[PDB]
Amino acid sequence: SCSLNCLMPKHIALIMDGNRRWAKDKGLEVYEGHKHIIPKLKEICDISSKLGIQIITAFAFSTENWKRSKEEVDFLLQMFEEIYDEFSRSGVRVSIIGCKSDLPMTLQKCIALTEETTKGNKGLHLVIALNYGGYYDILQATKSIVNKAMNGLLDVEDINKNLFDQELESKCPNPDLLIRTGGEQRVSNFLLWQLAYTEFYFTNTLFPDFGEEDLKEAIMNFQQRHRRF
């Protein structure tokens, strides 16, 4: 029984793609590219904070990236501990979404500490999606709703867009604009439910080259789209 008849973007979703190709093209080891991820992201938060943007959700590690080599996966998961150094004494408030229990317990602790030391910052809110996927987010929300029903807390007739939204890890307000660096035109199992009405902007610029002028261009393209539609 169905029946069908949340100028400057508030929330930006960021897919931080193209770091290996950047390094290989410069004659560098692949890992040199990955070392630019956290510092560039910090730089983008400072630029965005000054433009009036309020939320950034950034894709750092997907649930499919476990298919890469053991060497590359081990390097990346060790490298993400620098989140604490780069952000713990900044003006940014930091959260992580994703399945934290699959990560090394040392990373779990840096994450827990980064969230703790920055929780009171009133500026920009940076959400880092680490071991995250849209399938995972929808499935964990479904399991939560199933447990509430089995405990007598809701009826099937109470399941609606609002209820489901409150069980997801990324909630309303959803991204107004998605920026994906690195040339590819696909969402790669990022924020599936949350991107239903988001504007998609794809640039060929590789993530370690994405700078203030490139961000400004994406925002101008976004403002042009709204005069039109």
Ligand X SMILES: C=C(C)CCOP(=O)(O)OP(=O)(O)O
Does position 189 interact with ligand DST (CB under 6 A)? The reply is no
182 binds ligand DST (CB under 6 A): yes
Element (H, E) at 131: strand 125-132
Structure tokens at 120: 């009171």
How far is Cα 33 from Cα 23, in angstroms, rounded to an integer?
5
Catalogue the active-site residues: 17
Smallest distance, Å, CB 60 to ligand DST?
6
Q: Tell me the C-alpha distance between 170 and 127, whole Å.
A: 9
Of 19, 174, 203, 205, which one interacts with ligand DST (CB under 6 A)? 19
Per-position x/- string for 16-55, each x denoting binding to Mg ion as judged by CB under 5 A, each - no binding: -x--------------------------------------
Stretch that binds Mg ion, among 10-18, 25-33, 153-161, 208-216 (CB under 5 A): 10-18
Q: DSSP for 49-77?
A: HHHT--EEEEEEEETTGGGS-HHHHHHHH
- Kindly state whether residue 133 participates in binding ligand DST, applying the rule CB under 6 A: no
| Closer by beta carbon to ligand DST, 39 or else 52 | 39
For residue 93, give the 3-state DSSP assignment.
strand
Least distance in angstroms from the C-beta of 72 to ligand DST: 8
122 belongs to the binding site for its own copies (CB under 8 A): no
* Burial (Cβ within 10 Å: 0-12, 13-18, ≥19) of residue 143: exposed
Give yes or no for residue 189 binding its own copies (CB under 8 A). Answer: yes
The 128-167 contact track toward Mg ion, x by CB under 5 A, reads ----------------------------------------
The two three-digit tokens of residue 50, written as one number? 């000054």
Closer residue to ligand X in complex, CB, 15/219: 15
Distance of alpha carbon 94 from alpha carbon 204, whole angstroms: 28
CA angle 161/163/165 to nearest 5° reads: 65
Residues binding ligand DST (CB under 6 A): 16-21, 60-61, 65, 76, 182
